[PDB]
Amino acid sequence: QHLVLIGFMGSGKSSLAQELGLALKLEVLDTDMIISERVGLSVREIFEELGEDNFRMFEKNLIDELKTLKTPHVISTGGGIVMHENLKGLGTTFYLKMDFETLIKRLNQREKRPLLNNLTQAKELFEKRQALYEKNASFIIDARGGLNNSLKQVLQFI
Numbered sequence: 001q002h003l004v005l006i007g008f009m010g011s012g013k014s015s016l017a018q019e020l021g022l023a024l025k026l027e028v029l030d031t032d033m034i035i036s037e038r039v040g041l042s043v044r045e046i047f048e049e050l051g052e053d054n055f056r057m058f059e060k061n062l063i064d065e066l067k068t069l070k071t072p073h074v075i076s077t078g079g080g081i082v083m084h085e086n087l088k089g090l091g092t093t094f095y096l097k098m099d100f101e102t103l104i105k106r107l108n109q110r111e112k113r114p115l116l117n118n119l120t121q122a123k124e125l126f127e128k129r130q131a132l133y134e135k136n137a138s139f140i141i142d143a144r145g146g147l148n149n150s151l152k153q154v155l156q157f158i
């Protein structure tokens, strides 16, 4: 019963996460960051050098490991974390809901997947991911306004 942020790259998870940890004085984890740093490659180079399924295995395992932590944390999560059957039960999740249009400018990158530098593939991924964010959301948050306006809605779910 972590506070888990989800949704697509550039919807503002890590920044919300660093703000929520501060406001709530909880520790903040970032799954992409933890993997990149255990592996010693950017997430880009993980994809390039090691392939998506191996990244996806590093995500599956980290989810389980995060589940064993005692104290609640604020966790931001990579774009595809929802691909994982084992997210459910990590924590209370908050979907940072964005439209593709707003999203674009901000998702110019590093932890960015090579497919996310193809915009039509990006849009197709985005579309296919909508249903997965919704299915894995404890709460859905209109992320279109600022960091504050997302913060507002988060906190009311306590």
Ligand SMILES: O=C(O)C1=C[C@@H](O)[C@@H](O)[C@H](O)C1
Residues within 6 Å of the ligand: 009, 032, 043, 044, 077, 078, 079, 080, 111, 112, 113
């Ligand atoms: O949406 C995804 O599958 C990606 C999102 C990023 O947060 C990084 O997890 C990684 O680039 C892959």
